[model samples]
Target: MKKYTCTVCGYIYNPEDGDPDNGVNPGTDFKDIPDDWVCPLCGVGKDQFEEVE
Candidate 1:
């Protein structure tokens, strides 16, 4: 499994599911983000996601 971090809000995106209302759902991969899916916390583009290793 891979780890992703939101650069703007420091929100960690684990393999686990997030809130569906927030556009993040169960088993959702970072690559599954739609072109219009924006970060709810910081309003940053999906490009702001960074790999955490």
Candidate 2:
């Protein structure tokens, strides 16, 4: 699993760590995340996220 950052707020969602604030588990891939998954901080959808370098 890799990390993806929210373009709207720069809040990074590390899949290895998971977003406990939502429900994404550790080891979940960014691609596996639901299209509706929103940034826990900014409320932006997955479309606003991009893979971290």
TM-score of each: 0.74, 0.86
Across 1-53, the per-residue lDDT of candidate 2 in tens digits comes to: 56889899999888778876677888888898777888899898999888888
Error of 1 at 34 (Å): 1.1
Worst 10 residues of 2 by lDDT: 15-24
Clash pairs (backbone) in predicted model 2: none
Question: What C-alpha lDDT values do all the predictions have?
Answer: 0.76, 0.84
| Number of the predicted model whose lDDT against the real structure is largest | 2
lDDT, candidate 1, 1-53, per-residue tens:
57688898997777676548876777787787676777667788879989888
